Design a protein around this ligand. Structure first.
Ligand SMILES: OC[C@H]1O[C@H](O[C@@H]2[C@@H](O)[C@H](O)[C@@H](CO)O[C@@H]2O)[C@H](O)[C@@H](O)[C@@H]1O
Ligand SMILES: OC[C@H]1O[C@H](O[C@@H]2[C@@H](O)[C@H](O)[C@@H](CO)O[C@@H]2O)[C@H](O)[C@@H](O)[C@@H]1O
Lengths: 729, 303, 304
């Protein structure tokens, strides 16, 4: 190709104006095969310039000068200057050196992590460049490990500046797009490390129904299999493939009962101890792999081995799938060691994700992160987080930052996994985040005390958790449409603020704030409430524009950074003027696609929303106060329209237009009501409540209302009253 | 010592006195060059105020009105007039809020919560404006005292406070723009009326004299050393004082014992952000609570 | 030298650069032709306009094809090149390893403005004599970040006046000027007094400079050079000899507000010592905490 240049023992491939592959080969042969990371090097032709001399070469694109002075790659022989001025002297890449600016990516797991842990670099940098080293093995055409690359150094130089979304799109072109999730993945999951019986598990599922909590997935953790019943001469019961018959005397009947309740079923698989001689599938595996059964030779875990993988999928997973298991929870914690040098977690995720496609369309796994490109094998499973405010306070940042290495379907244990401390408010705040996260999977440790059941908690916490869990199912249309946009267009559901606002310094200073799809901006509260206010808080950056609280309609004039206060039952979620958000009107109703959609419209600007579905596309347009709904294909679906406050149209069938110009634009939210509520719940002196209510009611000029609150001895009460005055300005 | 002298100068009598200690002299030159110069400035101000004080003295004797009044004499139905114990009226033209607490070393400024009655008020010294009615924490360096005059205030000052003479040969008429006003200067052997009506300033006296009048309208000396009775039209003259938000902001940030990164960010953000409500939202995020109140005073004056 | 620069056309011609692709003359001090073009065609025109010597401000790492630190190549070649236009010329540049004392002056760079930075700096300065690097120029008052305190600025200037080089410098902040009249009348007058003292000391400094060059004796010595067998000469990190006639104990801690004085523990060697400024006497040998107002610095001279 014209986009390929060889010089000395190096090869340079200009894939885009902003993406260059850099290779070294001692043998003069360069690698064309796919790798664990890279699935596609076919990119459209681009323009660039070369200065080639006897001893040096310079490649020049719109954004980078790449220099190579010959010989082995060193920090002196191979380096690049970006054509940007984001920094004063951090604009140069040197081979093998780190530079400042990397916005980070993700890491394997949150196992044993209490609050923050270090992350790996991503492809995004504030200074406009990043290098992604390909250190993986080569694949065969069908996707088996083929061995070592002939490109003994193989690098990707990203020089996208702050065009983060295009960097991610081209990353997906190189490493392959995320597959589409199935709709069931986007609902509530129930999970608990608890030794349920068939009877007590179904009783709990029927209790969820009675309690008005919708579920899409039934996880069965490791007590599904033999544990204490495993003879100690075999080792532990951690790995198992044999039903505990006391708890599950008829597995297929139990899974049929979950299927009748419209639940998808997954089992915990700890693969590391393989198939030992006590297991129900051992006789078939032993025959297939020619094991010495009289010496009880184990089929040790070996995912490098084709015969082992075949026996694992066909003779170990196969019978369980025949009993009705829908997909696999791969729960690997036993290290990165294999004869091939390929991480066993990568081999599991790559091969299990492929195998899952045989029994179901668009199937998933649930497994830990296995390095760049492992977004091809959703879903991510972050694992055994410590239950703490610190862990919750890290998790939104962790989740949005992961989009910087394209790993956009993290499923966290909602409420935290293990250890840590009880606080029903922490559980409630964690569920609020989970509902506005990629995946909402409730899960917990082997403790008698860590159940995430809403009715574990008092009546106030229970009702709020049920409300948020119902909200998750109202959001499934929005989530599923965003899912198809991840798969087809390479856009993350969860974006850091700096994707949309790359030149705003405040977009780098609100770590836990994120865009959730294209219509909603989320600022979860991740700190214990101030008991004097009976409210939690978070500093929100409002971009330019008019913003509304998604729930209350409280308005905010951007651009501003403003501390916002919410009771423990309320979450800061915001929509711009013109936002249109579809909601399922019947989130409890078991139906493959919603029979009724609520179109929730935020007044004050034009907008539009495209609802992508399995078998349809529905466009909602809001232009000069006219709201129109059209679909590719006709259906019996009934549309409800909510314009700000008021339901305008109920259950209208087919395509239509309606003029909202003559309809009430304003939400109910008002300063006086909100003020009374904040003063009333506050654990402060009644004389202070009386004086604040009286003075803020009497003083007419906004600047003097602000001067009055500025004299308050309670600094946080000042900030709370200021938020109300700012919204009421 | 310096704050106590500031109060004394705006008290009924300014008598420096001290104990038998070798260490308690009230001589200004007992102190360092900064304190000395400020004490000399305030002590000269006391003599500039003698015409105002002597006129108020004759008003105590003849009309039973105190020189120093609690706020509630003028504002009996305002609850805030009972909540500012150290704030007072000083004659009829000036309202005083002495600073009586050691400065905040992070700000290099002392402070007092001032109640501003209804009306437009000016700092007597700087011309910094304040829209009443409001209660507002005000910040001053140790060399500066919170003293305020309403729009229309007229304050006579002795132009020659060091000059040994039984009555001033020269009076400065210090006029605060924005309203009508008047001042009656009672003396041993004269009465002089200063009137400010629809922007016309008039001076008349019961008896004629050689006295020379100076007129200062806000910022600017309009008339120097003019003899006898006269009128002058100030409608076409600059009403506005120099005091400006940007200069005052730079000065407060510059003396503050805070991080230079904080100074840089506050100066940059308050210069860039155009909408007053967003300037206030920006300072509301500051981790230094007293710095918030100081920046808020400047924003309130600059609104 | 990139394609927008005023000297680029001449450099491009000298180094055979591709001007239509705007090929930069990338920094390469391993390259004889680059160095020649840098000195003759980049620095040369600026020297012709009257620039006397070069402040080499290098912060971009230690990488080169040769394995020689670019900072060493800059200091070695620039110091040599500076001798062409002026006798006994200098540079101003960071330390480039043992032997780089051949290329004065040392430039310590972007210190944080803090009491902690000032408290390190006398020790830093005297200890440098142990690898023969005796002409450190510190940013007097600190370079960047940190916190405002006019007393820190005044104490830092006191040290600077009794340091190898007295260069006032500061960051891009509107708030960090080292102008004496930035501060109140007391600080301003003290800074002016110390700045005048620096010029009173130039004969003493210049004589010590010729003694460094001809006899290998540092201007600033740790106490243990003169008193190697006295344990106390190893226990006063910020105390030093300044030439042969003066012993300096800078105050590097914020004053005690109850005393309105700063302090430092001074080790007085055997002998009769006088405060250089006041004549206050001290009988050695003794370790004694000494107190000074913020306008006064502990500097001592022996009888004789
Ligand atoms: O399948 C049970 C459980 O396994 C993993 O978590 C374990 C955790 O619960 C246990 O306390 C620790 C202590 O050794 O080991 C594992 O981390 C898995 O992460 C979890 O989701 C499962 O529920
Ligand atoms: O020439 C300007 C300046 O450069 C150097 O110091 C810089 C410093 O002021 C800046 O804040 C930081 C932040 O990136 O970079 C450099 O350290 C040099 O050391 C200094 O003397 C100069 O004044």
């Amino acid at each position: 190709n014209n986009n390929i240049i060889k010089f000395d023992k190096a090869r340079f491939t200009v894939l885009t104006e902003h993406l260059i592959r850099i290779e070294y080969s001692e043998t003069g042969e360069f690698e064309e095969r796919m790798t664990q990371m890279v699935q596609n090097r076919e990119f459209s032709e681009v323009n660039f310039d070369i200065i080639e001399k006897e001893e040096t070469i310079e490649i020049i694109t719109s954004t980078v000068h790449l220099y190579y002075n010959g010989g082995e790659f060193t920090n002196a022989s191979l380096f690049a200057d970006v054509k940007f001025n984001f920094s004063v002297y951090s604009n140069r890449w040197y081979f093998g050196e780190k530079s400042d600016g990397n916005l980070k990516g993700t890491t394997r797991t949150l196992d044993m992590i209490d609050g923050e842990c270090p992350l790996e670099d991503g492809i995004m940098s504030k200074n406009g460049f990043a290098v992604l080293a390909d250190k993986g093995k080569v694949l065969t055409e069908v996707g088996d490990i083929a061995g070592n690359s002939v490109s003994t150094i193989d690098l990707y130089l990203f020089a996208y500046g702050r065009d983060y979304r295009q960097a991610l799109k081209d990353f997906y072109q190189l490493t392959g797009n995320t597959p589409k999730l199935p709709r069931f993945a986007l609902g509530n999951w129930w999970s608990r490390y608890y030794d349920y019986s068939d009877k007590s598990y179904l009783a709990l599922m029927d209790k969820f129904t009675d309690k008005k909590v919708p579920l899409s997935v039934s996880v069965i953790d490791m007590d599904w299999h033999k544990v204490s019943e495993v003879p100690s001469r075999f080792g532990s019961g951690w790995t198992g493939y044999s039903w505990n018959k006391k708890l599950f005397p008829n597995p297929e009947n139990f899974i049929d009962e979950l299927h009748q309740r419209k639940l998808k079923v997954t089992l915990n698989d700890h693969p590391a101890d393989g198939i030992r001689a006590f297991e129900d599938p051992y006789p078939q595996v032993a025959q297939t792999l020619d094991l010495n059964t009289e010496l009880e030779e184990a089929a040790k875990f070996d995912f490098d081995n084709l015969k082992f993988r075949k026996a694992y999928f066909e003779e170990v997973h196969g019978p369980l799938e025949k009993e009705g298991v829908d997909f696999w929870w791969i729960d690997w914690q036993q290290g990165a060691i294999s004869k091939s040098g390929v991480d066993p977690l990568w081999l599991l995720n790559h091969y299990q994700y492929q195998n899952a496609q045989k029994k179901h369309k668009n199937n998933i796994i649930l497994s830990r992160y296995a390095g760049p490109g492992s977004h091809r094998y959703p879903l991510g499973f972050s694992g055994a987080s410590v239950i703490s405010w610190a862990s919750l306070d890290f998790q939104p940042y962790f989740t949005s930052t992961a989009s910087n290495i394209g790993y956009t379907w993290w499923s966290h244990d909602i409420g935290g996994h293990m250890q840590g401390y009880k606080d029903a408010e922490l559980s409630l705040r964690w569920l609020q985040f989970g509902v506005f996260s990629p995946i909402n999977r409730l899960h917990s440790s082997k403790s008698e005390f860590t159940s995430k059941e809403p009715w574990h908690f008092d009546a106030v916490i229970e009702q709020s958790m049920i409300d948020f869990l119902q909200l998750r199912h109202q959001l499934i249309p929005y989530l599923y449409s965003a899912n198809l946009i991840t798969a087809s267009e390479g856009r993350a559901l969860v974006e850091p603020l700096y994707y949309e606002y790359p030149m705003e310094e405040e977009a780098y200073q609100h770590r836990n704030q994120y865009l959730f799809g294209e219509q909603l901006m989320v600022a979860p509260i991740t700190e214990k409430m101030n008991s004097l206010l009976q409210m939690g808080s978070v500093e929100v950056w409002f971009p330019e524009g008019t913003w509304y609280d998604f729930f209350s309609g409280q308005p905010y004039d951007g651009k501003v950074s403003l501390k916002v206060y919410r009771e423990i039952t309320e979450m800061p979620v915001f929509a711009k003027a013109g936002a249109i958000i579809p909601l399922d009107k019947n989130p409890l109703k078991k139906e493959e696609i919603p029979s009724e959609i609520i179109w929730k419209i935020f007044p004050g600007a034009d907008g539009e929303y495209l609802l992508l579905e399995e078998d349809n596309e529905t466009k909602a347009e809001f232009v000069n106060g006219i709201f129109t709904v059209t679909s590719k294909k006709e259906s019996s679906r009934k549309h409800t329209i909510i314009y700000g406050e008021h339901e305008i149209v109920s259950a209208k069938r087919g395509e239509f237009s309606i003029d909202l110009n003559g309809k009430e634009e304003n939400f109910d939210w008002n300063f006086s009501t909100a003020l009374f509520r904040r003063l009333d719940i506050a654990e402060i002196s009644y004389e202070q409540k009386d004086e604040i209510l009286q003075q803020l009611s009497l003083i007419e000029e906004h600047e003097k209302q602000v001067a009055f609150i500025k004299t308050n001895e309670n600094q946080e009460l000042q900030n709370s009253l200021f938020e109300l005055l700012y919204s009421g300005k």
